[PDB]
Amino acid sequence: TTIAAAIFDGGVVLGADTRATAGPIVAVKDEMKLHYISDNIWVCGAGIAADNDNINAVISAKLRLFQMNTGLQPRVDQCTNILASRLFQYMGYIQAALIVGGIDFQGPQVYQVAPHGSFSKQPFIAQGSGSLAAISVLENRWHNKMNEHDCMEMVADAIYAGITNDLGSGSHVNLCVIKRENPEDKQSKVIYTFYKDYRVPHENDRNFRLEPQINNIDVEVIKTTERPLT
Amino acid sequence: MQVITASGAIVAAKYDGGILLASDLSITYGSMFRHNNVSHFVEVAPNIIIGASGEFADFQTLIEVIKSVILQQQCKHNGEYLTASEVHNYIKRYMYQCRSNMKPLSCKVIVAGINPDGSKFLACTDPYGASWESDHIGTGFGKYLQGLQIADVVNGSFDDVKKGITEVFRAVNARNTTANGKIEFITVTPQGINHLAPEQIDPNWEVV
Amino acid sequence: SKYDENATTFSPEGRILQVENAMKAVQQGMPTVGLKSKTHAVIAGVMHSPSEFSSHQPKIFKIDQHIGVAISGLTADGRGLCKFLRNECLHHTFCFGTEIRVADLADTVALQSQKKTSKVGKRPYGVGLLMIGAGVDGPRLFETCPSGQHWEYNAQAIGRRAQAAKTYLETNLNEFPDCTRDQLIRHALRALNDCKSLEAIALGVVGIDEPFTILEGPELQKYID
Amino acid sequence: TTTLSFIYNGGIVVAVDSRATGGQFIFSQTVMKILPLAPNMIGTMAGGAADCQYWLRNLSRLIQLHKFRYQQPLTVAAASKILVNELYRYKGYNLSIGSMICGYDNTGPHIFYIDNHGSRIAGKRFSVGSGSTHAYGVLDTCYREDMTKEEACELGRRAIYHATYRDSGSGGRVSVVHITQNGVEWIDKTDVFDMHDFSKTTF
Amino acid sequence: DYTRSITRFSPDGRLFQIDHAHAAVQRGTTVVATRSKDMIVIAVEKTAVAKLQDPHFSKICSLDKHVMCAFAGLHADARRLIQSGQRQCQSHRLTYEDPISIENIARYIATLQLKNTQSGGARPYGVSTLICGFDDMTSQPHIYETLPSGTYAEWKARTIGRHDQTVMEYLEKHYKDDMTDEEAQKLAIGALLEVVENGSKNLEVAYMKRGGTMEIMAEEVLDALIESTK
Amino acid sequence: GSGYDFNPITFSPDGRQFQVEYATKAVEKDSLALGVKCKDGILLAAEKNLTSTLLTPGGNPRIFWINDSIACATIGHRPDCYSIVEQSRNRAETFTSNFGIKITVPQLASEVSQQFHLAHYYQAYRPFGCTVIFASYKDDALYAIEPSGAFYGYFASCFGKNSNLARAELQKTEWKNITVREAVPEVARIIKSLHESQFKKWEIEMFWLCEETNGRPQKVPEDVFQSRFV
Amino acid sequence: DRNVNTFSPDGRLLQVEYAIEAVKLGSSAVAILCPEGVIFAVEKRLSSQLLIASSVEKVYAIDDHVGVVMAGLAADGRTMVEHMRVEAQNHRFSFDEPIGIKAVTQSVCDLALAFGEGRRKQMSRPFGTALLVAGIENGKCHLFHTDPSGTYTECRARAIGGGSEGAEALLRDLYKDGMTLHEAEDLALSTLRQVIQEKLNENNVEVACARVSTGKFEIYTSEQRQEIVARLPP
Amino acid sequence: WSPYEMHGGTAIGICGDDYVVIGADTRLSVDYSIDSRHKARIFKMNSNCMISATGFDGDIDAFITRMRSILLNYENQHFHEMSVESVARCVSNTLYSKRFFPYYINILVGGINSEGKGKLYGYDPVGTIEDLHYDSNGSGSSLAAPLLDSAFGTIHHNTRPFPAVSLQDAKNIVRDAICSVTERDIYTGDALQLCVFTKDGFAQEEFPLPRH
Amino acid sequence: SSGADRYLTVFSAEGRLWQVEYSFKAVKQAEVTAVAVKSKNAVCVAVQKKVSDKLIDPSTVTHMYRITDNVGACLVGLPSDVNFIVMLLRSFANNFEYKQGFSIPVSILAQMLSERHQLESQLVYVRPSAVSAILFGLDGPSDSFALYKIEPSGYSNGFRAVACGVKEIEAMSALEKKMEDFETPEATAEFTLSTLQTVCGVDFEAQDVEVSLLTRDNSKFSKLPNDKVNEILHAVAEK
Ligand SMILES: *C(=O)[C@]1([C@@H](O)[C@@H]2C=CCCC2)NC(=O)[C@@H]2CCO[C@@]21C
8 A cells, every 4th residue: 555645835635546455466456545534634544444444434424523513624633633542542453554634724734643543743644555665755756835736746656656666556546635725715615626546557557458358167057047136 | 560660779777776778869771870869768657768679660659559548547547647567568458459450560669667656667568469577678689689788787786787788788889780879878767767868889899 | 397308308407307317216226325534445335125035135346356336226227337347447457457546437437327318319327336446546435426427525325315324424524534444334334324224234345455345244243333 | 189989779989089189299198089069969079179179069058058948959960060050150260170979869879070161971980080090990890780888889999099009190098988869978988008909019 | 220119118017019019910810720649720711802812812821841830910020920930940951950840930930029029110020920830859749829029829729810719719619639630620620610701712721741841721622621510 | 498499409490509508507507617828827717516525625526637738627517527528538639649749729629519519410419518618828728618519719718607707707807917826816716706605615626737837737736725615 | 208218207217117017917926945946936827728838938947057937028038038048058158167046147137228229220128027037056046036127136035927016925924044845845836826816736837946956947847736736735 | 470479488287186286487588589587477367276378478468368357257247256167168268269360378277176176277279178187388398298297197097097196296396397398498497487276275486497 | 200390300381491490590699790792803701700708719709710721711600500610611621622632612612511501401310500601712723703602501602792690681782782893802801891890780890800801812711910901991981
């Protein structure tokens, strides 16, 4: 896995590869590792896919219930505190290395949350197996108050670096750009644009396939029964 | 049972006027000399001092427990403190409780005090909860680097017991890695607890 | 009357009528007398014999080596309080290794009775305890009440016909501090005799060095004169 | 340890050694490995000494409680069942109980092998202990149904003696008990030192 | 939990709640349990709409293969008693491997009723139970009557429910010390008929033979015995 | 009058807590105890109208230790008085366990007023018919908690019978201008002036927390002021 | 009032007094202590001849040495005797000795007054049964009386049940400290017969002896009850 | 982490016709270090019996406190001091109550029963009870047991009557056996506490032993 | 079970929670009135500080409490209930800060207090806490001032201006009849103290009123020292 969220001038760009491996085998080639938390907060997670999915769903439910009861926009530090407390109370057994990326009244905030509950506000973060290959790009191409497009390209290139250099990472680069609908208006609605398959590396696609599929296995049917679908 | 932030050796010995306890004022983090001027003894009552060799975190937790219980019994008794025997019995029962809960206080705790009847009471409770009352108790390397230097002068004059404890702690400073700094002396007498000036007990360094 | 519903209900006058009913239940117990000298403490009482051929129900109990209590009221509640006090003495002789002070036992039993009177669904103990102890605190006598309070006394009488015993104790109050063990026991028996309606009177005597002991029947004959 | 109990036409003969030994040292040679449970029921002690003694006196308490609660006394099957259920509730606590519940009830003689593990095996011939294999060899080789009381008691005594000889864990004195309809009878405690025949040169 | 001490003493010394539970019993259907040297017989009268309901809801229950059980009173309190009694029979088998003594199980049912008389927030069982059966440990058929008060007494022939006094008088008059099994059947059937103006279509008769299970009398044999008694 | 006076949590149609008012009546029945903050310390004086001459001289305390720096004068229902004393000791011990430092009379009073209020706020409790005056020189605090749970810091507090006149007399002195040793005669004169003639034998249980006591609670020594009167 | 653990303005637990009344509504029972043994004679109320008398046993053997006879509510007495049996077997298990008569009496009494109401989850009402606990302890027969209040008293002679007061009045001038067990049985059966409303018979009476010579509490069989009723003056 | 200190020290009990002589070394010591040269391990439980515990001293103190608590409870609830046989059963049950967290102490309950006869009961840490004429516990149990076997021959011939050894002879046997153990067992040493329970009550003697 | 509708918090035959209304009257029993005014630039809460006896240390006779640094609470009601509510609002705030990681907003604190007052008005074994609570502060997420009132019923609302206590009806009437979108914090403070003074019908001194004026500058809660209170009172006595 390669997940990387950075903070650009107008918002946050989160990114994730789409490769879930069931050991040394690529179980999923379109895996969704960017989890919607709230309209302003997205978490891209690594570690155990079940743990990441469930904890992101649970915290998204908590913050949706929060925004409903209280009418308040969930805060990125609030989401990060909830995530860190939950991961600490499970003593790292919920292997969800998360990167929270959102925009609240404090501006664009990217937090890391380790599976053991250790969080940290950082401008750019990379987690997962390819986290190092990604963070190199993030280390070299992130600067204060970069525009949306440069941060998008940097985070996509960091996810691509994780994809190519790391075996646990691969397939496509899904991005999610949290940004204010009116960047000049700091009080404008925080919207998100999810770029599914933002990068689709052509050198990483299936380049060959038998047009006449050769098969010498013959199916012998012991018994057939047809039953209505209602 | 694990010792990290450890208090060094303690040598307590009864002399004519009371109990003389010596120990360095240094807490060692593993082997590092981390903290200085940290007394290993805590005056829990006007005539009851409590020291401990071993983990000093477990001795601060034990002192919290002791002070809370003494405060309970003092509020009950309108100012009257627990006796040295009662305080040591509570420490024995709480350290055995901790050992029985499998979370032992990894500190050998010396209770030195004058009971209201005037009899010197010096007792020790090891991390496991085994307690014993004795006229002289060494804990840590003060137990090991002792010999007959205390036993021969125990219950003797203050000068003789002080010299014996000084010999033992010269041995400790020479041959204990965790022995760092001045050796504080505390006299628990029926007239109160007096912290004598800490003394640098130098090993004989003409050996080289 | 209408506010005599629970031990948790205050009457418009500030009185807990169920607490007062329990106090009367104590006042309906057999005459109990307690005395306190500078060296010894004594509790005595005419034990109750429900039937002619039934023995006199024990009234004096030994809580600890130097602590005893004379119950007045529901003897079952008295036994429950004796169990509680013995547990407290055993947890003070476990935590501290010495004998608890009868003052601390009075505090604990008062606290328990008050918790009985402060929470609904509980009744005040229908028994009053004359506790005598001896220790570093000296000899001390405490009359614990159902309401949840203990009154320290040099002498005291409770139960039925206890006004005559109280009058005797008031007359001889200044004698008690210097009275010896034998003289304090004699004063106890002669304060009970004024309440007579011996083989009924049981007397527990304790001293600073003397452990609490219960004398009954002919054993007390030597203390009559 | 070595305890044996067998049902012959005349009753139940229960013979037990008296050795308690841990490792090499013989902690005792006068250990009583037969604990009475009912007037006509006993329970043998093998394996852990404390466990067997506590649980057999607890079973005696439960049998007395049942007999006083209900006029009918607790049977040997019911008693062994109580014991085995209690011991099985402590599975995984490293209890060590080997115990033959030998009694005469309304349905006749009954021996139930009870173990810490919860096994409750009815049978007419059991032996529990380190030397129980030797007692089993002597029993199964010399056991008859029509043995007199003396013959059956001597069979149990000699089986325990051979177990004590061939096992370091068995020794002391053979406590022999004869259980009949009438009730438990304690035959005698025979020192295995006296049972050994020193005129033999083979053992 | 709720503890309102439903059952309390009255100034005259009576547990009025036990009186009311007895009233509930006395409004229940009549039950008549009689015994012989080798067979027990229970006859419960049944009030029902023969044309509109199934008469298969029986007051006679089988706590175990050797414990037969009938009741008079609230059918739900009786169902709870029978369920607990069956559980106790199986638990006695678990704990002892021996069939629960009829005295033992009757004591258990009476102790259930008694605990309801003693437990705060618990309404005394408005049911009087006839626990009958056979003990191999005693070689005697037993018929215990457990009351709502929690008192159980063995009887040679006992009746509960409505008309219990008339049926008791009939039992006392027509009881033989050494009845045969068919004589016990005749006594129970006649005692129930003394208050019932209907034949097999109303009565329900079960029985337990020595070392046997509970067998419900047929509607043919029952009618034959009814006619023979008359 | 109306039925709103039985349940402590019940509010009278005028908003009155009748059970709390009756607890306050219980306080007002008791002999007055007072406290005054002085230059050198705080002096708590409790009038003990000895019901019997047999009561131990100097026994039956009304001023209690709560902490090595906090004393507690008590007025009202003596069972409730000592219950609150022990609950204050437990609250101080729990405060030390949770926070390490020794509790202060303001927050000790808040924590004990929490129990006072719970008594008449949740059902199943009786309001404490006791007013507790916590004094601490080391905290320069004299906080009196009332039966309702209302607690106020006082320059000079007093509760019990003739408490209004006692407060009016305490008002005549600027207590902080003087020390405890010269405050003792003034408070003693106040109570003696208000002492009722009906009570022949009585005592003035004075305690002080001062520099002379090193801030520790201590009964005023008999030589300084013989507490016992006739 | 209206709650079980309430004290009357006279200082009495109302439920306790009402349980005493319930005991006064129970079958009579006379316990006569003599140096040879303690003898219970109990009225077995038989509403019918079909009632198995052995099953309405008002006498219960708590242990080999100690027994108990009830008066009042037979079910509450069953709870009390069950507790006493468990206590006696626990005492034998814990101290390898028969439980003292006073000890088991005190245990059941402590159980007696533990009733409560109004607190979250205990018995809800006092035991409506008074027990005459008797047994052999250290080669001596001890007779104790427990009533619903939880108070127990050692007794040389005692009566519980409907005829309790009349039985005690009859025992006034009939009971002596040196009677033989023969005389104790005769006195117990005579007092019971006097305080019951039916002619005494072996089937409507239950007799039991805590016998010092045997050191055991046995319950008399029909033959022994006949052997006693035959000797009576009537 | 092992919650026991495995303290050494020997206790030798000898039951007589009318006495019980338990001699235990005072020394408290484990791992070549003597925590306390004097640390009494025989305690007068009541006027009927004494308990001698050898092993972990924390467990000795805890078990002796529990036994004193239970004997006080028995005196309060059963109105007489617990007998030596009752104390023995209580010791067995108390030790077994911790069957899964055993007191690592070997117990000798020596007392005088209602018959006036001496009663010694030997124990293992998990609560095995055994009515014994003699027993040895602690570090020098293996050393001391042959001494008692030779003195009495009970192990050599189990079924023969236990020899009528006088009170003073049994005290001398315990002293000599404790001295031999002290000579051989390093943990045994310092002072011998020789307690004797007789009809006259609990008597105690302190004899020096080799400190080394 | 009939008859509990007036003594317990269950609905009456006419559908009213009589105990809740009686808790409102118990709030009236506080003998003190609070007026809070909220403006775009500040929120000022003035509550009369009536010390009945001057033997009492006035610093302890307070109806204004620090729930958090940013959130204050002017609580009018039974003093015991007021202390319970300060401890329960502080507990709410601490639990919220421990879970969510940030200081509790005034709106969420008002919701939690309303939930507690609903558990009081529903659980018949819990007395309705007789405290009319004026929670106020500067919410960071909106960087705007929040002013909520939670009545003993739990009926919680956000207010431009609110009032509690004996003159609650008259104070609210005066507030609504004179509310303005003030342009300065000191005009909000002047209006607050003027409305409180007018409804209480007595001239105020700093000794006789606790005023907390949370501005955009001083967002953190603090009761104004007597100097600023006297200055505002003089400004209110100008006209
Ligand atoms: C990524 O860390 C990874 C993915 O399965 C990932 C898990 C969390 C989000 C969903 C998809 N976790 C793994 O266990 C493998 C090992 C290498 O990294 C994975 C692909």
